[PDB]
Structure formats: C-alpha cells, structure tokens
Design a protein around this nucleic acid. Sequence first.
DNA 1: AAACGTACGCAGTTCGCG
DNA 2: CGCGAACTGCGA
Length: 760
Amino acid sequence: MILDTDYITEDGKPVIRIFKKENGEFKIEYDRTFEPYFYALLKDDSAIEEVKKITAERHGTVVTVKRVEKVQKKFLGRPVEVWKLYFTHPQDVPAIRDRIRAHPAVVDIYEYDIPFAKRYLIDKGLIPMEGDEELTMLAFAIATLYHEGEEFAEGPILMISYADEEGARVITWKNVDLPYVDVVSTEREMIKRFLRVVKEKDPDVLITYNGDNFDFAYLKKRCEKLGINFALGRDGSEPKIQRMGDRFAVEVKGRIHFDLYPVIRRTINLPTYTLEAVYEAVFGKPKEKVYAEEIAQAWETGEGLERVARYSMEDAKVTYELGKEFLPMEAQLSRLVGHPLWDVSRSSTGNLVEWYLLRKAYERNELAPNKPDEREYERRLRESYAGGYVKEPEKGLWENIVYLDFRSLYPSIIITHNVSPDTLNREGCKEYDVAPQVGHRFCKDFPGFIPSLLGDLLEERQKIKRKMKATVDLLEKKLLDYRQRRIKILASGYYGYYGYARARWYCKECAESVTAWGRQYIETTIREIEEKFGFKVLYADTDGFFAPIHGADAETVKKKAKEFLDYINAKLPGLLELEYEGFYKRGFFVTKKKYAVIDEEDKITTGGLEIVRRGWSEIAKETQARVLEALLKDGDVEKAVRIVKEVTEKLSKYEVPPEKLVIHEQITRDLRDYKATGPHVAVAKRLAARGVKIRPGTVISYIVLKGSGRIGDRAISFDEFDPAKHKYDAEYYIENQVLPPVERILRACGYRKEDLRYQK
DNA sequence: AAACGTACGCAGTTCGCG
DNA sequence: CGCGAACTGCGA
Ligand SMILES: [Mg+2]
Ligand SMILES: [Mg+2]
Ligand SMILES: [Mg+2]
Ligand SMILES: [Mg+2]
C-alpha cells in the first residue's frame, strides 16, 4: 500500500521516495530515474534548437534544457503537436519556464507547475491507499497554560495525552493521582517522553484535532525554546509546517498526520465544530469541555488538576475514536481521486477535482490546460452566470407536505447532455444537445472528458447508499451516510469547477448550461405536479421542492406523490431522476433558503435558520427552537406566543443567566483592514489595545450591556463581564436577539408579529 | 508554492442622504 | 425620521 510520495535532492539530483506499508512493514522505495518535464508549443519545429539553448539560474545552479522530444497529444480532444522539455531537477522548471514562454517562437507552455512528487504518482499510475493493509494509529493532544496578552506558546505545555487500542494516557510534570497519568519533573522531560512513546509505538498515522494550527505549532515553538530535537518523523526529521494557500498544514515524514478538523468540517453540518460537539454528533454521548481559564487556575493553585487530566485524557481518547471511523472514509477518497491521504483530507473540492482530472488526462494523452494568468483570472472573476431557480415561498403553516428532489441534478445533466469543454461547439458532429436559454451546443457523438468520469463517481455513491439502507447498526449507518454525501458534494463540485476562476478546465459555457438545464427541469416538474396532479408547490430551491395537496389526507398525498413520480420519471430523460425524499406532517417556509419541517416521527429539520447560525445568543436560539416545537409538533400558535412572552419577561426582570446572552462572531482579517466597526470588531480592537493578540480566526465572545451609544459601544468581552457591576441590555436582547427570529416565523405562517414581547 | 467549486440567498450593524 | 446602501458573516 502506497502511503505518500516526496523527493529529496542527492548530489544535485532528485530521488523520488515512495513511502509504503507492505506486509506489516514500513518501506521506502527510492526512484532516481524520474525526470521532471513540461511542454511547449512552437510556431515552427525549426526553433527547437534555439529553445534548447535557453538557460536560467537557481540559487547558484545553472539551469539548462536536459533533452527535448516531440510528442503528439490531444488538447480538448483535438490532436496537437508539442515539445516535451526534460530537466535534471524539478526546481529547474520554475526558474526557466518564464524565459522559455517569453521566446517569440514559443506560443505557450503547459504542465509546468505540477509538484514533482504528485507528477510521479500520476505518470506511474500509482494509486495510494490501495489494498487491505492495516495502518497503525496514535492520536494525541496537548493542554497548555495561557494568559491574555501573551505571545503564542509563551507559556509551557502542561499535559500531553495520547490514545490507541491500548488505551489513553497523560504525561505531565505535576503530580496528578490518576492511574493513566505519568508524572515527570519538567516540561522538557514530558516532551521527550512523548517523543519516546511515538518512537516506540511507531504509528503509521498521527491523529489530531486542529493539530495543523495549534498542537504542532505549539510543540514546535516550545521545542525551540527548550532546545529539543522534536524528531517525530521516521527519517528522524522534525514536523514540517507547510502553507496551503491561506491555511497552515503540518506533515510528519514517514507517517501520515491525520487532522480530523478539516475532515469533519466538510463531512458533518454543525453550528460549531468543537471536539465536544463533534464527538456527540457522531456517537451520541456528551463530552465535558474544560476551558483554558480553569486549566490555568487548576495548574497555578494546584487544586482541581484531576479534572484537567481527565479532560486531556478524553481529548486523546475521543480523537482516536473519531479517527478510527473517518480514516477509512478518507482512505477511499484517496483511492478514488488517486492522491495521498494527507493532501486529500485537507484539499479543497476544486483541487480534488483537478487532481483527478490531471491523472485521467495523462491516461488519455490529453494535454492539460493551464491555470489562468493574472489577466484571465481577473477576467473570469468579473463574469458570472445564472444559477438555480429559487421560488419565493408561499406563506403559512402547511400540513401533509412531501419533499421531492433530484438524485444528483447537476452531475446527471452533465452526463445526460455530455456537457464538457471538449464537446462544446465541437465542429463536424453528428448529434448534439442545445442548452436552453444560453444556447450552447454539446456534441453527443463521443463521451466527453468530464462526463465519462462522473458516471463512476455516481455509481460509487449508489453502492454506498445501498449498504447504508441495508446496515442496521446505527453508527455504521451514519458513517456511510456521511460517506455518500462526500461523494455527492464531490460530483456536484465538478459543476462549480466549471465556474471556478482558477480552474484548468474552466468552462463558463458549461457551467451556465448545467444551471439552465437545471432550471428547466425543476420548472417542468413543478408545472406537471400542479397541472396534472393538483399539487401546490410551496417552496422550491434548485434541485428540490415541497408540495402538499390542499385538503388531502396523509395517505392521499403519499399515494398521489408516488403516482406523480411514476409519471414524471418516465418523462424525464437520461440519468435525471426525481426521488421521494420525505413526508412531513407540518412545515412552513420563512423566506428563500429558510424553512422548517417535521416528519411523522416528530423529528424537526430546518434550513438557514438562526439556531444553526453564529452571531445569535443562546437565549435567542433556544427560544426559536421552542417556538419551532410549538408550531410544528403541537400546531399551537398561542403556545409559541406565550413562550416569547415568558422569555422577554425573564429578560426584562434580569432572571436570565448572562451566559445565555453571549454572542460569538469571528474576526476574518487584520483589524486594520476593517472598513466598518461592528460590535465584535470594536471589542476586538479594545482587547488588542490592552495587549490581547487578535488574529484572523479569533472568535469574539461578547455581551451587550445597558448603556448609551451604538451596540458596539455597549458590548464587552464576556471574560471581562462581572455581574456585580454590569447590567446587561435587556431591551437589546428582547428587541434585537429574541424577537426578530420568531417575529419573521410568525409572519411567515400567516400571523401578526404584534405584542410578542412582555411589556409593563 | 499553492490558491475558497458555484449562484442564490438572508440579516445585523452602522450611518448618511433626502 | 425612514430608507437604503455599505459592510459584514455565513448558510442547495
Ligand atoms: Mg507531501
Ligand atoms: Mg485540542
Ligand atoms: Mg466569476
Ligand atoms: Mg426517466
């Protein structure tokens, strides 16, 4: 099983290293024969001799063209003749490529910015994560001592915990009486002991939660101060910090650092993504969170450290359990895309599409298009196109509603109508499909590049869905549900890739053709279910819609819905399929992209509501959730009105605990780059003036106090809140937090928003 | 050296124009 | 004052 690939430079020459795990043994295979290259298109072949003489320089090394070779390939399906230029070192390509393109006889260059290790995996047809090999795993987490106004890693690490199949243990340099706690003398001995544990265990995978941005960077800075060689790699190397665009990632040579945070972020939809919320969402059991303030107080006073050690232990144990379930899912995606697990687990949907396209293009001798230059990139940003059809929702609290949607609308359209840049307006074709409204033609004589690959993706999702319904184990049912959803967003990401300004296979014509077909098919289905089956579509968004039959039983609606699915699916062509996704006894639709429904099991599912959004206090989210229950479950508008009255009265009389009034908002940039100052920016700017380090990603937890001025003038960081000297703004939390979310709900159901709050 | 898939949306805060 | 625009953050 190929784990990963990289390259090292040995005497000025690159050596490909293939990290593998075969027969329970970790092995490194060395390849010194692979040569870097890129392509160049010439006006006349006679100029290849002058192109060969082009040189460049790279930190003291003269770069020359090692060897050239003319090859016949295809560009967007059309035959093309290009020159393959070979070089000694992969870093020769960045140094010389601009000078080669600048030659007047060179029309353009291609495939000049593909990493050397990834190029090796593609050109050798090597697929990582293939086979039934078992990878050894070890999760770990750290607990630190923090104070406001300090620099990163200024305080020491207090505990290092780790967990595998043998259990979880904690290393610390203070005496904590717990059987899973090993006590050393100093922070240095604690770090060195953890380094020994990893070396003796020798795990293939190191599991963390947000280790890319916290745990590894913290251990690194501490090791520099204490003068510790943090040799976590199997080659003895230290963890290397890389920069994937605007985010940081940490690799450990010889192993795979599996950071669960970017995996869970894309796999599960949650309001917050703390480790505690993630563990409960997957396993159903709660996990206690111990904050940095309690950790600092327990360590410094010396009292209550057993609770900190248990929290640190649970961190490693929970991270291992989560890593056990999600590694096989991400391992399959690595097999599907053909990219290492380390990159796949953190890669964006766009790069996951492009890397698979790059591999398939090589297999088909298709020359890859380039990433756009600066002019073309900004040109693509300035152009857009129409998207999905969103109907203005009908007002009211409705009963006996079915939800019908397409199985995979955009991928189904791409395959059915052969939407591909190599098929767009292709001359001399014997059959083509014309997109409505936008009029783009797409050849149907041969399978397009992208349509020929989307079919296998949709097949993999249907196999996962088949095992999903058959599985009875509730856990395994949930992971497979997560897994097939990841395939859906990947296949759906092929459409968005057509409109991604940085995409190699950029095709705005392909993108708007997909959405135009999507708008036509959803509007056709809405028209047919209303005119032929007497339904009334209440709300529709892109690929699905909600609709009941006015004054019909639950059974009458279910039977007529299945009757319509038979009629409409016989009419719909190709791979397009409308599905029966659910029946809901009650439901209402506030605005576009905002709704709430309840099934026959009293399970409430919502979309775009304030309960799942950041920036609303808990007293507002909890009140909306209770109003949701009174309307959907009990059909009791008066009860929902009484709930809001009881809440606003408790707020006016200062009987609500201030912890439920905390608003959380994230700082997204450098504080100097904010053009407007809101409540969370004003609190951040005030904290930064006191020495607090505010960075992009810092979550501001503030509470609005009773006072004067704007809301930002009255807001203060909640850690500075003292209930003995501060009085929270009861009028603000009534009028601005609690009322608006429920006011819009009661208006949308057909009821006045008047007299919802308590008044004297 | 890589680099957020897309369009379609809502809604809070601030603040100036008419 | 009322409204809307700008800014801001994020949810098929
Ligand atoms: Mg790598
Ligand atoms: Mg952690
Ligand atoms: Mg654009
Ligand atoms: Mg059909």
